[PDB]
C-alpha cells in the first residue's frame, strides 16, 4: 500500500505516489504551502517552471509533487536551507546544510554549527559518491552554479519572504546528470520587497561552489 519516501531532512510525512514519478507531501499545520504554490503560479509563473518541482494536484491534505529523484539511477541528494530558520541562526552563517545522502558515514550532525572549512568539507563529502573523475564532478558544480546564478538574479524581482525554503541538490553517481530546485513553501509569506537574506544564502553557495570548481 504505502511506501515511505527516503527524505533527506525536514519532518513532513512524504510517501511515494501510487503511480511513477510522483511523491505525496502532507500539509501538516495549514494549507499555506498550497496557497503559495498557487500564488507563485499566478504572479511568477516563469520562476515556478524553472526552479520548483511541478505541483500535479492536491488530494485532501496531500500535495502531488514531481519526484526530483525519479530520472536518476543513483541519486545523491543534499537539502540546504536557504530561507530564514524559525529561531536559530544558520549553521554556516548564510545557510544550513540540513542533510545529504550518506551524511551518517561522515558524522554529519544537523545541530552542529560549522566553520567555513567544515562547511566545505561536508559539501566535498556529499560529492564523494561522484567518484575520482575530477572533470565530471567539476561539470556538476558548474551546472549547479549556472542555475543558482540565474536563481539569485531572478530573486531580486520576487516579493516573497522565502522563510524555511530549501535547495535540493541532486547528482547521479556517474555525474551524467544533476539539478538543483527550490522546495518547501510551508512558511513563505507575501512582502513588499525582495528577500535579501535568501539572496545572500544563494550568492554564498555560488561563492563556495565556484571555489570548489576552481580548486586544483
Ligand atoms: O527553522 P529551523 O531552526 O531550521 O528548525 C525548525 C525548528 O525551529 P527552531 O525553533 O529550532 O529555530 C522547529 O522547532 P519548533 O518551532 O517546533 O520549537 C521545528 O518544528 C521545524 O520542524 C524545524 O525545521 P526543520 O528541521 O526544516 O523540520
Ligand atoms: N519534489 C521533491 N522531490 C524529491 N525529494 C523531495 C521533493 N520535495 C521534498 N523532497 C525531499 O523531502 C525532504 C523534505 O522536503 P521539504 O519540502 O523541505 O519538507 P519539510 O516541510 O518536511 O521540511 C527534502 O530534504 C527532500 O529529501
Ligand atoms: Mg523543509
mmCIF file of C-alpha atoms and ligand atoms in Angstrom:
data_model
loop_
_atom_site.group_PDB
_atom_site.id
_atom_site.type_symbol
_atom_site.label_atom_id
_atom_site.label_comp_id
_atom_site.label_asym_id
_atom_site.label_seq_id
_atom_site.Cartn_x
_atom_site.Cartn_y
_atom_site.Cartn_z
ATOM 1 C CA UNK A 1 0.000 0.000 0.000
ATOM 2 C CA UNK A 2 2.198 2.900 1.395
ATOM 3 C CA UNK A 3 5.965 3.300 0.580
ATOM 4 C CA UNK A 4 7.655 5.962 2.796
ATOM 5 C CA UNK A 5 9.784 8.296 0.622
ATOM 6 C CA UNK A 6 13.510 8.407 1.709
ATOM 7 C CA UNK A 7 13.539 12.112 2.909
ATOM 8 C CA UNK A 8 16.980 13.780 3.435
ATOM 9 C CA UNK A 9 15.645 16.360 6.017
ATOM 10 C CA UNK A 10 12.508 18.062 7.498
ATOM 11 C CA UNK A 11 9.591 16.411 9.442
ATOM 12 C CA UNK A 12 6.605 16.243 6.994
ATOM 13 C CA UNK A 13 5.001 12.918 6.066
ATOM 14 C CA UNK A 14 6.090 12.194 2.450
ATOM 15 C CA UNK A 15 5.246 8.928 0.627
ATOM 16 C CA UNK A 16 5.700 7.617 -2.937
ATOM 17 C CA UNK A 17 2.664 8.249 -5.171
ATOM 18 C CA UNK A 18 0.620 5.192 -6.241
ATOM 19 C CA UNK A 19 1.973 5.968 -9.815
ATOM 20 C CA UNK A 20 5.513 6.607 -11.197
ATOM 21 C CA UNK A 21 7.317 9.964 -10.814
ATOM 22 C CA UNK A 22 5.086 11.476 -8.046
ATOM 23 C CA UNK A 23 5.540 11.992 -4.264
ATOM 24 C CA UNK A 24 2.737 12.921 -1.865
ATOM 25 C CA UNK A 25 3.637 15.509 0.785
ATOM 26 C CA UNK A 26 1.206 16.035 3.655
ATOM 27 C CA UNK A 27 0.467 19.671 4.609
ATOM 28 C CA UNK A 28 0.770 19.332 8.445
ATOM 29 C CA UNK A 29 -0.485 22.626 10.130
ATOM 30 C CA UNK A 30 -2.146 24.740 7.377
ATOM 31 C CA UNK A 31 -2.606 24.691 3.582
ATOM 32 C CA UNK A 32 -0.111 27.696 3.357
ATOM 33 C CA UNK A 33 2.219 25.610 1.070
ATOM 34 C CA UNK A 34 -0.669 25.152 -1.461
ATOM 35 C CA UNK A 35 -1.676 28.873 -1.249
ATOM 36 C CA UNK A 36 1.950 29.860 -2.016
ATOM 37 C CA UNK A 37 2.352 27.341 -4.958
ATOM 38 C CA UNK A 38 -0.917 28.903 -6.418
ATOM 39 C CA UNK A 39 0.298 32.497 -5.782
ATOM 40 C CA UNK A 40 3.705 31.869 -7.460
ATOM 41 C CA UNK A 41 1.907 30.204 -10.370
ATOM 42 C CA UNK A 42 -0.322 33.330 -10.835
ATOM 43 C CA UNK A 43 2.356 36.053 -10.264
ATOM 44 C CA UNK A 44 5.787 34.474 -11.089
ATOM 45 C CA UNK A 45 4.957 31.562 -13.428
ATOM 46 C CA UNK A 46 8.461 31.604 -15.081
ATOM 47 C CA UNK A 47 10.093 31.253 -11.635
ATOM 48 C CA UNK A 48 7.866 28.221 -10.852
ATOM 49 C CA UNK A 49 8.660 26.496 -14.171
ATOM 50 C CA UNK A 50 12.467 26.982 -13.870
ATOM 51 C CA UNK A 51 13.181 26.401 -10.145
ATOM 52 C CA UNK A 52 10.369 24.424 -8.433
ATOM 53 C CA UNK A 53 9.077 20.808 -8.679
ATOM 54 C CA UNK A 54 5.751 20.605 -10.586
ATOM 55 C CA UNK A 55 2.617 20.503 -8.441
ATOM 56 C CA UNK A 56 0.378 17.985 -10.258
ATOM 57 C CA UNK A 57 -2.600 18.420 -7.950
ATOM 58 C CA UNK A 58 -3.938 18.028 -4.431
ATOM 59 C CA UNK A 59 -5.703 15.117 -2.652
ATOM 60 C CA UNK A 60 -7.226 16.326 0.671
ATOM 61 C CA UNK A 61 -4.139 17.485 2.635
ATOM 62 C CA UNK A 62 -1.570 15.777 0.247
ATOM 63 C CA UNK A 63 0.345 17.760 -2.466
ATOM 64 C CA UNK A 64 1.134 15.562 -5.532
ATOM 65 C CA UNK A 65 4.652 16.750 -6.485
ATOM 66 C CA UNK A 66 7.205 15.890 -9.128
ATOM 67 C CA UNK A 67 9.705 13.403 -7.661
ATOM 68 C CA UNK A 68 13.016 15.253 -8.340
ATOM 69 C CA UNK A 69 14.938 11.920 -7.847
ATOM 70 C CA UNK A 70 12.825 9.987 -10.376
ATOM 71 C CA UNK A 71 15.030 10.238 -13.522
ATOM 72 C CA UNK A 72 18.246 9.125 -11.669
ATOM 73 C CA UNK A 73 19.838 5.657 -11.475
ATOM 74 C CA UNK A 74 21.842 6.520 -8.342
ATOM 75 C CA UNK A 75 20.716 9.889 -6.933
ATOM 76 C CA UNK A 76 22.761 11.754 -4.320
ATOM 77 C CA UNK A 77 20.623 14.445 -2.584
ATOM 78 C CA UNK A 78 21.601 17.392 -0.346
ATOM 79 C CA UNK A 79 18.992 19.610 1.390
ATOM 80 C CA UNK A 80 20.330 23.129 2.066
ATOM 81 C CA UNK A 81 18.018 25.542 3.957
ATOM 82 C CA UNK A 82 18.476 28.969 2.254
ATOM 83 C CA UNK A 83 15.424 30.792 3.722
ATOM 84 C CA UNK A 84 15.317 32.109 7.326
ATOM 85 C CA UNK A 85 15.075 29.456 10.034
ATOM 86 C CA UNK A 86 12.277 29.779 12.633
ATOM 87 C CA UNK A 87 14.535 30.981 15.519
ATOM 88 C CA UNK A 88 18.149 29.721 15.156
ATOM 89 C CA UNK A 89 20.910 31.336 13.130
ATOM 90 C CA UNK A 90 22.213 29.309 10.128
ATOM 91 C CA UNK A 91 24.816 26.566 10.866
ATOM 92 C CA UNK A 92 27.015 28.040 8.000
ATOM 93 C CA UNK A 93 26.159 31.704 8.653
ATOM 94 C CA UNK A 94 24.119 32.352 5.446
ATOM 95 C CA UNK A 95 22.571 28.833 5.020
ATOM 96 C CA UNK A 96 22.304 25.457 6.849
ATOM 97 C CA UNK A 97 23.071 22.124 5.254
ATOM 98 C CA UNK A 98 20.133 20.030 6.600
ATOM 99 C CA UNK A 99 21.251 16.584 5.321
ATOM 100 C CA UNK A 100 22.721 14.631 2.431
ATOM 101 C CA UNK A 101 22.893 11.088 1.038
ATOM 102 C CA UNK A 102 25.471 9.117 3.151
ATOM 103 C CA UNK A 103 25.931 12.012 5.693
ATOM 104 C CA UNK A 104 25.839 9.412 8.525
ATOM 105 C CA UNK A 105 29.224 7.991 7.199
ATOM 106 C CA UNK A 106 30.854 11.438 7.816
ATOM 107 C CA UNK A 107 29.292 12.036 11.282
ATOM 108 C CA UNK A 108 27.234 14.903 9.894
ATOM 109 C CA UNK A 109 25.102 16.496 12.638
ATOM 110 C CA UNK A 110 22.389 18.978 11.605
ATOM 111 C CA UNK A 111 22.581 20.699 15.029
ATOM 112 C CA UNK A 112 26.361 21.359 14.665
ATOM 113 C CA UNK A 113 27.477 24.981 13.883
ATOM 114 C CA UNK A 114 30.182 24.733 11.157
ATOM 115 C CA UNK A 115 33.277 26.795 10.335
ATOM 116 C CA UNK A 116 33.884 27.718 6.630
ATOM 117 C CA UNK A 117 36.303 24.818 6.435
ATOM 118 C CA UNK A 118 33.805 22.256 7.941
ATOM 119 C CA UNK A 119 31.017 23.609 5.644
ATOM 120 C CA UNK A 120 33.242 22.996 2.551
ATOM 121 C CA UNK A 121 34.266 19.545 3.883
ATOM 122 C CA UNK A 122 30.543 18.408 4.170
ATOM 123 C CA UNK A 123 29.918 19.580 0.583
ATOM 124 C CA UNK A 124 33.021 17.647 -0.521
ATOM 125 C CA UNK A 125 31.700 14.617 1.455
ATOM 126 C CA UNK A 126 28.374 14.920 -0.411
ATOM 127 C CA UNK A 127 30.321 14.929 -3.744
ATOM 128 C CA UNK A 128 32.475 11.797 -2.845
ATOM 129 C CA UNK A 129 29.887 9.368 -4.385
ATOM 130 C CA UNK A 130 30.504 11.129 -7.734
ATOM 131 C CA UNK A 131 33.948 9.449 -7.892
ATOM 132 C CA UNK A 132 37.518 10.494 -8.748
ATOM 133 C CA UNK A 133 36.971 11.832 -12.332
ATOM 134 C CA UNK A 134 37.652 15.498 -11.387
ATOM 135 C CA UNK A 135 36.459 16.623 -14.919
ATOM 136 C CA UNK A 136 32.949 15.072 -14.418
ATOM 137 C CA UNK A 137 32.466 16.382 -10.820
ATOM 138 C CA UNK A 138 33.603 19.894 -11.931
ATOM 139 C CA UNK A 139 30.870 19.838 -14.646
ATOM 140 C CA UNK A 140 28.188 19.007 -11.956
ATOM 141 C CA UNK A 141 29.442 22.002 -9.887
ATOM 142 C CA UNK A 142 29.395 24.315 -12.969
ATOM 143 C CA UNK A 143 25.822 23.297 -13.942
ATOM 144 C CA UNK A 144 24.667 23.976 -10.315
ATOM 145 C CA UNK A 145 26.487 27.363 -10.446
ATOM 146 C CA UNK A 146 24.753 28.188 -13.772
ATOM 147 C CA UNK A 147 21.259 27.561 -12.317
ATOM 148 C CA UNK A 148 21.946 29.132 -8.873
ATOM 149 C CA UNK A 149 23.405 32.281 -10.569
ATOM 150 C CA UNK A 150 20.175 32.662 -12.578
ATOM 151 C CA UNK A 151 18.059 31.941 -9.400
ATOM 152 C CA UNK A 152 19.878 34.665 -7.396
ATOM 153 C CA UNK A 153 19.466 37.084 -10.360
ATOM 154 C CA UNK A 154 15.707 36.199 -10.574
ATOM 155 C CA UNK A 155 15.099 36.519 -6.781
ATOM 156 C CA UNK A 156 15.810 40.327 -6.973
ATOM 157 C CA UNK A 157 12.360 40.675 -8.720
ATOM 158 C CA UNK A 158 10.253 38.389 -6.419
ATOM 159 C CA UNK A 159 8.269 39.909 -3.497
ATOM 160 C CA UNK A 160 8.199 36.846 -1.184
ATOM 161 C CA UNK A 161 9.968 36.147 2.083
ATOM 162 C CA UNK A 162 11.243 32.588 1.435
ATOM 163 C CA UNK A 163 11.263 31.594 5.146
ATOM 164 C CA UNK A 164 12.214 27.904 5.614
ATOM 165 C CA UNK A 165 12.767 27.156 1.866
ATOM 166 C CA UNK A 166 15.458 24.633 0.858
ATOM 167 C CA UNK A 167 17.579 23.929 -2.240
ATOM 168 C CA UNK A 168 17.508 20.229 -3.200
ATOM 169 C CA UNK A 169 20.861 19.449 -4.922
ATOM 170 C CA UNK A 170 20.848 16.127 -6.867
ATOM 171 C CA UNK A 171 23.554 14.395 -8.945
ATOM 172 C CA UNK A 172 23.836 10.863 -10.304
ATOM 173 C CA UNK A 173 26.905 8.807 -9.119
ATOM 174 C CA UNK A 174 28.072 8.658 -12.799
ATOM 175 C CA UNK A 175 27.829 12.527 -12.854
ATOM 176 C CA UNK A 176 25.867 12.209 -16.167
ATOM 177 C CA UNK A 177 23.002 14.347 -14.739
ATOM 178 C CA UNK A 178 22.411 16.915 -11.981
ATOM 179 C CA UNK A 179 19.953 19.658 -10.930
ATOM 180 C CA UNK A 180 19.014 21.960 -8.060
ATOM 181 C CA UNK A 181 15.459 23.123 -7.264
ATOM 182 C CA UNK A 182 13.656 25.188 -4.539
ATOM 183 C CA UNK A 183 11.227 23.276 -2.249
ATOM 184 C CA UNK A 184 9.129 23.739 0.921
ATOM 185 C CA UNK A 185 6.853 26.795 0.677
ATOM 186 C CA UNK A 186 5.128 25.944 4.060
ATOM 187 C CA UNK A 187 6.402 29.199 5.818
ATOM 188 C CA UNK A 188 6.685 31.535 2.784
ATOM 189 C CA UNK A 189 4.983 34.975 3.179
ATOM 190 C CA UNK A 190 3.982 37.884 0.886
ATOM 191 C CA UNK A 191 6.133 41.032 1.412
ATOM 192 C CA UNK A 192 6.557 44.345 -0.459
ATOM 193 C CA UNK A 193 10.270 43.844 -1.298
ATOM 194 C CA UNK A 194 12.735 41.071 -2.367
ATOM 195 C CA UNK A 195 14.298 38.671 0.219
ATOM 196 C CA UNK A 196 17.932 39.825 0.757
ATOM 197 C CA UNK A 197 18.690 37.060 3.335
ATOM 198 C CA UNK A 198 17.672 34.299 0.842
ATOM 199 C CA UNK A 199 19.628 36.071 -1.958
ATOM 200 C CA UNK A 200 22.690 36.130 0.430
ATOM 201 C CA UNK A 201 22.338 32.359 1.059
ATOM 202 C CA UNK A 202 22.334 31.682 -2.718
ATOM 203 C CA UNK A 203 25.317 34.027 -3.503
ATOM 204 C CA UNK A 204 27.280 32.459 -0.602
ATOM 205 C CA UNK A 205 26.644 28.961 -2.031
ATOM 206 C CA UNK A 206 27.731 30.231 -5.501
ATOM 207 C CA UNK A 207 30.930 31.562 -3.953
ATOM 208 C CA UNK A 208 31.700 28.258 -2.168
ATOM 209 C CA UNK A 209 30.830 26.065 -5.171
ATOM 210 C CA UNK A 210 32.887 28.307 -7.548
ATOM 211 C CA UNK A 211 35.948 27.835 -5.169
ATOM 212 C CA UNK A 212 35.378 24.043 -5.338
ATOM 213 C CA UNK A 213 35.024 24.032 -9.134
ATOM 214 C CA UNK A 214 38.256 26.091 -9.435
ATOM 215 C CA UNK A 215 40.493 24.317 -6.888
ATOM 216 C CA UNK A 216 43.490 22.455 -8.359
HETATM 217 O O1 LIG B 1 13.628 26.622 11.304
HETATM 218 P P1 LIG B 1 14.764 25.613 11.925
HETATM 219 O O2 LIG B 1 15.641 26.148 13.040
HETATM 220 O O3 LIG B 1 15.726 25.159 10.529
HETATM 221 O O4 LIG B 1 14.188 24.239 12.506
HETATM 222 C C1 LIG B 1 12.778 24.176 12.769
HETATM 223 C C2 LIG B 1 12.663 24.262 14.280
HETATM 224 O O5 LIG B 1 12.903 25.613 14.523
HETATM 225 P P2 LIG B 1 13.811 26.243 15.680
HETATM 226 O O6 LIG B 1 12.608 26.713 16.668
HETATM 227 O O7 LIG B 1 14.642 25.112 16.217
HETATM 228 O O8 LIG B 1 14.513 27.601 15.054
HETATM 229 C C3 LIG B 1 11.189 23.982 14.669
HETATM 230 O O9 LIG B 1 11.094 23.951 16.161
HETATM 231 P P3 LIG B 1 9.718 24.412 16.926
HETATM 232 O O10 LIG B 1 9.177 25.607 16.173
HETATM 233 O O11 LIG B 1 8.755 23.037 16.901
HETATM 234 O O12 LIG B 1 10.069 24.570 18.547
HETATM 235 C C4 LIG B 1 10.720 22.681 14.031
HETATM 236 O O13 LIG B 1 9.390 22.407 14.329
HETATM 237 C C5 LIG B 1 10.842 22.638 12.432
HETATM 238 O O14 LIG B 1 10.432 21.196 12.072
HETATM 239 C C6 LIG B 1 12.359 22.918 12.219
HETATM 240 O O15 LIG B 1 12.667 22.988 10.895
HETATM 241 P P4 LIG B 1 13.099 21.553 10.071
HETATM 242 O O16 LIG B 1 14.389 20.959 10.533
HETATM 243 O O17 LIG B 1 13.266 22.041 8.485
HETATM 244 O O18 LIG B 1 11.924 20.423 10.079
HETATM 245 N N1 LIG B 2 9.744 17.256 -5.060
HETATM 246 C C1 LIG B 2 10.650 16.523 -4.380
HETATM 247 N N2 LIG B 2 11.312 15.503 -4.958
HETATM 248 C C2 LIG B 2 12.176 14.757 -4.239
HETATM 249 N N3 LIG B 2 12.503 14.852 -2.945
HETATM 250 C C3 LIG B 2 11.816 15.866 -2.397
HETATM 251 C C4 LIG B 2 10.894 16.709 -3.025
HETATM 252 N N4 LIG B 2 10.368 17.623 -2.137
HETATM 253 C C5 LIG B 2 10.930 17.289 -0.983
HETATM 254 N N5 LIG B 2 11.846 16.255 -1.091
HETATM 255 C C6 LIG B 2 12.581 15.569 -0.027
HETATM 256 O O1 LIG B 2 11.867 15.759 1.167
HETATM 257 C C7 LIG B 2 12.668 16.401 2.185
HETATM 258 C C8 LIG B 2 11.812 17.369 2.961
HETATM 259 O O2 LIG B 2 11.228 18.277 1.987
HETATM 260 P P1 LIG B 2 10.562 19.682 2.404
HETATM 261 O O3 LIG B 2 9.705 20.106 1.234
HETATM 262 O O4 LIG B 2 11.610 20.588 2.936
HETATM 263 O O5 LIG B 2 9.587 19.182 3.567
HETATM 264 P P2 LIG B 2 9.552 19.554 5.183
HETATM 265 O O6 LIG B 2 8.293 20.550 5.255
HETATM 266 O O7 LIG B 2 9.329 18.228 5.776
HETATM 267 O O8 LIG B 2 10.829 20.266 5.613
HETATM 268 C C9 LIG B 2 13.822 17.028 1.399
HETATM 269 O O9 LIG B 2 15.002 17.089 2.192
HETATM 270 C C10 LIG B 2 13.999 16.049 0.224
HETATM 271 O O10 LIG B 2 14.789 14.939 0.610
HETATM 272 MG MG1 LIG B 3 11.947 21.673 4.600
#
